[PDB]
Design a protein around this ligand. Structure first.
Ligand SMILES: [Cl-]
Length: 223
């Protein structure tokens, strides 16, 4: 309750009283009493604590949280120090190394530095049962995160959405292309990264779009 950013809590307030949200909360509570669920309860909404909703400049969508011990901490693609960057993040860093001048691999996979600058690192599904990918899909989270994307689409303007993978492309269909910028590419996973992600240069393009909208670019190196 206290681990949920105030501006976000206010703008997303309508969701908390909806039937799907109540059922989702009931489900997750049940799961946490019977199994180990990631990320910890107090980090499920970390993405709402790094910056205000009005200051979001870029949005990156993920699927569900990493399901390994000590990995997930509320930000998509990010892992808690000193956990090593998972395969997808390795490719994200690889693209950054060639796309952003002066970018250097930070040696860890904690993306908090980006979130603090206004990069929303949103997983479509916010919890996962330990060791079981997609174990919490189709339980209500997708609707809640759709609400987040919709709020930004309707209430903000000039936000850059980086959609990686078919799943993110579909989820991003709700985004108003007339009010925001949408960049798409295949997923950074080693299974698909070589078919378009590597070379997509979304990070420099994103900053180009921000400058255009009279907004300060993201310092992708600040990790
Ligand atoms: Cl738990």
């Amino acid at each position: 309750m206290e681990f949920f950013g105030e501006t976000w809590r206010r703008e997303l307030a309508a969701e908390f009283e909806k039937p799907y949200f109540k059922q989702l909360m009931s489900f997750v509570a049940d799961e946490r009493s019977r199994h180990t669920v990631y990320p910890p309860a107090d980090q499920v909404y970390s993405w709402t604590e790094m910056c205000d909703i009005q200051d979001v400049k870029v949005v990156i969508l993920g699927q569900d949280p990493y399901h390994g011990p000590n990995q997930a901490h509320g930000l998509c693609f990010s892992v808690q120090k000193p956990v090593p960057p998972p395969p997808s993040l390795v490719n994200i860093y690889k693209e950054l190394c060639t796309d952003i001048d002066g970018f250097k691999h930070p040696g860890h996979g904690d993306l908090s530095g980006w979130a603090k600058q206004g990069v929303l690192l949103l997983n479509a599904v916010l919890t996962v049962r330990a060791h079981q990918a997609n174990s919490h899909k189709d339980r209500g989270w997708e609707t809640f995160t759709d609400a987040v994307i919709k709020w930004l689409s309707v209430n903000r303007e000039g936000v850059v959405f980086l959609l990686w993978g078919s799943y993110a492309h579909k989820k991003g269909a709700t985004i108003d292309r007339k009010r925001h910028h949408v960049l798409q590419a295949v997923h950074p996973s080693p299974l698909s990264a070589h078919r378009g992600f590597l070379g997509c240069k979304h990070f420099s393009k994103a900053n180009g779009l921000l400058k255009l909208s009279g907004t300060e670019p993201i310092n992708w190196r600040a990790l």
